[PDB]
Amino acid sequence: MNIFEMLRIDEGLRLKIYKDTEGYYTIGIGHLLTKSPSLNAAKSELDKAIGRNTNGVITKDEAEKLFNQDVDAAVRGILRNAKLKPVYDSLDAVRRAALINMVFQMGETGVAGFTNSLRMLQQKRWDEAAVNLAKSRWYNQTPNRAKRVITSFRTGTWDAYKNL
């Protein structure tokens, strides 16, 4: 298992514009297009991201290219963030992937907001962090996914994703 496989499980793959859990226009493997309510605004961003007139539909190859860029960006966002970097550097490979997943989902700003949890992860207090991570809107809105990421931080293994 790796970050790509993990996120592919959590986000799925859709080749036509769709609405995410929050009602925002998205495509491919969780690539957010816009928070705007307009499908046209979404189609415009899509075309600009792909470089061609898509008409709201893309190919598998194109979805994977957006995905590669998005994972890369998440990683680079963590390394540039004063609050996240030190956490990321202190973690083992499985747990780093869990932090990337959260950033991919909610953005660097959002994750950096989890001050107390971050401090606990840094201290390697796994069970404590897991409980604190669960006291969040994130967990309440997307509990199944949140549980998978939380289990990864708690155990340091990929157990939550093997079977999926």
Residue 95 vs 145, nearer CB to Cl ion = 145
Task: Assess whether 127 carries a catalytic annotation.
Answer: no
Residue 45 vs 100, nearer CB to Cl ion = 45
Q: How far apart are CA 115 and CA 113, in angstroms?
A: 5
Task: Assess whether 11 carries a catalytic annotation.
Answer: yes
Catalytic residue among 10, 11, 45, 62: 11
Which residues form the interface with Cl ion (CB under 5 A)?
A: 49, 142, 144-145
The alpha-helical segments, DSSP class H, found in 51-136 are 60-80, 85-90, 93-112, 115-123, 126-134
Angle CA(64)–CA(18)–CA(75) in degrees, nearest 5?
A: 40
Instruction: Give the strands of the sheet with 25-28, arranged side by side.
Output: 14-19, 25-28, 31-34
Give every CB contact of residue 91 below 8 A, 6+ residues apart in sequence: 99, 121
Catalytic residue among 20, 47, 64, 128: 20
The annotation places the binding site at 32, 104, 117, 132
The annotation places the binding site for substrate at 32, 104, 117, 132
Which residues are catalytic, by number? 11, 20
